[PDB]
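User: Predict the full complex structure for these chains.
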Amino acid sequence: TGGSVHSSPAIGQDGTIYVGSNDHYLYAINPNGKLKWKFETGGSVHSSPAIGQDGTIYVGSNDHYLYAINPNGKLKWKF
Amino acid sequence: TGGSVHSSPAIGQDGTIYVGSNDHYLYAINPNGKLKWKFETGGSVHSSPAIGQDGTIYVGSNDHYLYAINPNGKLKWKF
Amino acid sequence: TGGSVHSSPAIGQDGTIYVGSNDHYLYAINPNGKLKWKFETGGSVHSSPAIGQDGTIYVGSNDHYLYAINPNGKLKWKF
Amino acid sequence: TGGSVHSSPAIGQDGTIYVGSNDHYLYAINPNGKLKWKFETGGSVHSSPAIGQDGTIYVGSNDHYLYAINPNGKLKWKF
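Assistant: Here is the predicted structure of the four-chain assembly.
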């Protein structure tokens, strides 16, 4: 990545690794180490993502929002 | 929300997302992205919430306290 | 307790809530909100505690050590 | 260890306790308190490690990389 990784990673049911970074991105990485996708938030992602029963990834960001992201990398909703 | 989100989200038995924020509040969000309730502490909430077997949500705050909150949103006890 | 609580709490099998604080103490609290015991480290405890299979409570401190503490509240070892 | 321990410990399938430290190392410590191995990253390890189903340890570092480490303490890949 291009920023310090303060978020603690979470592992999806299929092995996908989700982690936030200081470059405003929540990352999704395959077990082989290559990028599944990346989601742009407004600020540093110090929150550690949590994975729902249906696969939704929830993580907070420094831009005041709690994000919900579908497993394909596009936004479900933000609070 | 109106504060930086450092707490990492915790997901309840029914899918309720709990996360703290710098605006002194512990938020509770429904899986559809709408507020269920919010509880106010006396400082920033950087601890990440932990959920018990009976649904109690535990979380710390900068105001020296450890909070226990029932799933309704009202205080159980503080330490 | 007394001090900013950055440690995210962990929940034991019997419902005991373990959390660290800046007062150099690791805290074990019963589900009712009363103190069970406290263990003193050499620095602030920002690490969130993790619980082993036999009940051992692992947590780190700013005094460079990782602490292993028995469920009764006494030192198992420190690294 | 050599630096402050902010990473939260994670427990493997065989009871191994994994934790990061500000000395740029990810530690693997047996339940008996003896060192199993330590893996050097570029910068401080604030991220709390996560463990996949095959035993891979995922942790973030201040050197911008997300690390995947085999159970034997050797690098699988970095992102």
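The beta strands of chain C are 10-11, 17-20, 25-29, 35-40, 50-51, 57-60, 66-69, 75-78.
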